[PDB]
Structure 1
Amino acid sequence: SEQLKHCNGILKELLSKKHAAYAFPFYKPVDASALGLHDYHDIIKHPMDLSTVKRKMENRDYRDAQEFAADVRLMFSNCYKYNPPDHDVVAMARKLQDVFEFRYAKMP
């Protein structure tokens, strides 16, 4: 749909080199074992990341823009839940979420 094309455009922007300096933590699922975050999956019940959003978009999983937005927002919320608010990753999440929200608001 037209709205899903807008969402795909947003997705491509979030993955683009333009935003890589602060988007990179969100590219792939959090590897909790790798990062030593042995409480991550006790605190975060529904992990989400941009590669998962991209797979869902490619597989036509999302039926509308609202479903797409809920997953992107879940990704950011997981970051805000797990990490203290002064953490560098939280600053990065806030910056990427600003990119997302401002462009999502321009939905046709």
Structure 2
Amino acid sequence: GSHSEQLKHCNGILKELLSKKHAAYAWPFYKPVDASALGLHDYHDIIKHPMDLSTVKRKMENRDYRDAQEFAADVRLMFSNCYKYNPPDHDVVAMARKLQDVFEFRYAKMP
């Protein structure tokens, strides 16, 4: 129920999402989506603001998050990016869901 200890909580969420525990679904989000390499046609038109956990990690370490709601919007932006671009039956879409399940729960248990 404070900023400095809430941001601590979000750091906690970040570490969990990046831990070896969640590696088998989390791995597409470790780094910025490489649209060229993966052949994602029009990825940069369809997707206004890219976001991944490495970006989130950086703003966290440089202390660029002013509050928790902001952390949240970036994390959800990252998943929404995935859901927007991809067909519902896409493998990565299932993976976004499983990681987001982890996100939403620990985020709900915030002070």
> Which category of TM-score, normalised to the shorter sequence, fits these structures?
over 0.9
Range with bigger deviation, 14-23 or 31-40: 31-40
Q: Secondary structure at the match of 1:96?
A: helix
Question: What stretches of structure 2 of length at least 5 have no aligned partner?
Answer: none
Once the two structures are TM-superposed, the CA of residue 36 in structure 1 deviates from its matched residue by 1.0
Once the two structures are TM-superposed, the CA of residue 38 in structure 1 deviates from its matched residue by 2.9
Q: Secondary structure at the match of 2:51?
A: coil
User: What stretches of structure 1 move > 3 A for 4+ residues in a row?
Assistant: none
Superposition CA RMSD, Å:
0.5
What TM-score do the two structures reach when normalised by structure 1?
A: 0.99
Measure the CA separation in 1 of the matches of 2:41 and 2:94. 22
What TM-score do the two structures reach when normalised by structure 2?
A: 0.96
Q: Secondary structure at the match of 2:72?
A: helix
Q: Which among 77, 94, 99 is matched to residue 96 of structure 1? A: 99
Q: Output one character per residue of 1:21-71: Cα deviation in whole Å (capped at 9) or x when no partner.
A: 000000000000111113100100100000000000001100000000000
**Residue 88 (structure 2) aligns with:** 85
